[PDB]
């Protein structure tokens, strides 16, 4: 087989409807191999390119992009939907690059895959459109997951006490994280993207937790410091279990970790002051002084942080040149970098299941 897909011009809207507009992420045939709609879409583009039909190439690509935009505008607040079409848009972009005919994108191609490259059309401009589209989808993905995690963080990371041995707990957050990760993995999202999403989620957890520390006196004690450190340790072990220790997610928690440490360490002598300054390099001077100010003990034999100690801290942190930041922007989104991940999938072997409702498509 050639590895193309033929369809009548009158069936283009029918094609985009079932494959994009009304396609279900949890489809049995869709969960055989990842990115199947993306592969099917590209196989049609090849035939259009093979037919030297510039009008069909233009219409199909236009119908494709607009159909993806439509689903994400309708089913906007669904994680699985956004996750699925982020994965497939990227894979559709992968195909357009991998089979572009450009030497820079064919370094990992087989001899037969190179025979499947486009021969008549330069779709460089269309690849830029999808690239920018992919950015918007990722942005939308982050917003959806942020809206779910945000109400769980304060209750689960701070208020719920377990260190001494319905509302949200740490396990609630852990379960939600597992759900997010499992869905993205099932869709076969690029691992580079998954890691960036996880990093984004951990920053959200860290920033919101740390902001509450910097705003609440009833959260600044050594006991709370221990609780926070344990909670973070659970998040770290989740990262390790999921093989995500290179995602950057752990490093985003470093300001929170050092704040939890600051709550626990001694705060009286000049050695204590020097230790604090050497320890809190991921916290700003304003943040450090704030925690020391908000530090409200809950036992009898322990005194509050003196004004003399705080002055000592500010004196030592005078020569440091750091950010003036106090509260963190919990809404901040790290700029996403998109990988190019060509596959070994042989287009001539790809079959189209009957459950997709695409029988009108001829396999060329």
């Amino acid at each position: 087989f050639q590895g193309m897909l033929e369809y009548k011009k009158e069936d283009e809207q029918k094609l985009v409807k079932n494959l994009i507009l009304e396609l279900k992420p949890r489809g049995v045939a869709v969960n055989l191999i990842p990115g199947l709609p993306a592969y099917i879409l590209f196989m049609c583009v090849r035939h259009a390119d093979y037919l030297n039909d510039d009008q069909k190439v233009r219409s199909l690509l236009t119908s494709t992009i607009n159909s993806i935009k439509k689903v994400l505008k309708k089913r906007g607040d669904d994680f699985e939907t956004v996750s699925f079409w982020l994965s497939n848009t990227c894979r559709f972009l992968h195909c357009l690059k991998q089979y572009s005919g450009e030497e820079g994108f064919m370094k990992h191609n087989t001899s037969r895959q190179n025979e499947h490259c486009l021969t008549n059309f330069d779709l460089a401009e269309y690849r830029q459109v999808l690239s920018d589209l992919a950015i918007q989808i990722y942005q939308q993905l982050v917003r959806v997951l942020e809206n779910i995690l945000q109400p769980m963080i304060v209750s689960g990371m701070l208020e719920h006490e377990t260190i001494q041995g319905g509302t949200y707990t740490l396990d609630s957050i852990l379960r939600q994280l597992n759900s997010f990760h499992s869905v993205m993995c099932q869709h076969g999202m690029d691992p580079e993207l998954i890691k960036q999403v996880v990093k984004q989620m951990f920053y959200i957890i860290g920033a919101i937790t740390l902001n509450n520390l910097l705003l609440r006196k009833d959260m600044c004690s050594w006991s709370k410091g221990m609780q926070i450190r344990y909670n973070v340790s659970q998040l770290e072990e989740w990262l390790r279990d999921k093989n995500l220790m290179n995602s950057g997610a752990k490093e985003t928690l470093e300001p929170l970790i050092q704040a939890a440490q600051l709550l626990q360490v001694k705060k009286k002598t000049d050695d204590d002051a020097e230790a604090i300054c050497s320890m809190c390099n991921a916290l700003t001077t304003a943040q450090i002084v704030k925690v020391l100010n908000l530090y409200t003990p809950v036992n009898e034999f322990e005194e509050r942080v003196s004004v003399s100690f705080i002055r000592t801290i500010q004196m030592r942190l005078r020569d440091r040149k750091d950010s003036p930041q106090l509260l963190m922007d919990a809404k901040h989104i790290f700029p996403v970098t998109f990988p190019f991940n060509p596959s070994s999938l042989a287009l001539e072997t790809i079959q189209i299941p009957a459950s997709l409702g695409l029988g009108f498509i001829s396999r060329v």
Binding site: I163, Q164, G165, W222, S223, G225, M226, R229, Y230, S233, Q234, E237, R240, A260, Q261, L263, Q264, V265, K266, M279, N299, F301, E302
Partner: protein, 172 residues
């Protein structure tokens, strides 16, 4: 993950004897030659099988330093096991075992399972604490005994396996 038992285990002993690396070796198979003094309290978990049951070890870690009594109380609170660690190449850390035993008796439950651990057994050429001397002290004071090397991993799994099993014998 699921478990049948949750055992809180604490690590105690002089600074530098290798408590934190025993933790890292057991819970994540990692070791650091350049590990620094532990700040506040650290935590790590691992589940093992004992008598067909899943036992989740919740291991607490802290520096061998002086601190507010309330923090020490919180550290020992609910602990069912304890690794009392010294450095076989540093006799002073073994001499101070009595001090840590005293802290144990002052803060821990009377039925806490205690294992005396001689760490850094890889430093054979530098041994300052005879195995027979330490074992005799352990037996005399109702402690289990083992020598480990967090560095080359010798007996680290066995140490935790044994103390978790002895706890299981008591609480199951």
């Amino acid at each position: 993950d699921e478990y049948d038992y949750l055992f809180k285990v604490v690590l105690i002993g002089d600074s530098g004897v290798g408590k934190s690396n025993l933790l890292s070796r057991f819970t994540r198979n990692e070791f650091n030659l350049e590990s620094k003094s532990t700040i506040g309290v650290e935590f790590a978990t691992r589940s093992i099988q004992v008598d067909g049951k899943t036992i989740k070890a919740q291991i607490w870690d802290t520096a061998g330093q002086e601190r507010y009594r309330a923090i020490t109380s919180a550290y020992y609170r609910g602990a069912v096991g304890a690794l009392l660690v010294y450095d076989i190449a540093k006799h002073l850390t073994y001499e101070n075992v009595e001090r840590w035993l005293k802290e144990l008796r002052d803060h821990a439950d009377s039925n806490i399972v205690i294992m005396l651990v001689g760490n850094k057994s890889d430093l054979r050429h530098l041994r300052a604490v005879p195995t027979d001397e330490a074992r005799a002290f352990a037996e005399k004071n109702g402690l289990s005994f083992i020598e480990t090397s967090a560095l080359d991993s010798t007996n680290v799994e066995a140490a935790f396996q044994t103390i978790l099993t002895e706890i299981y014998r008591i609480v199951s």
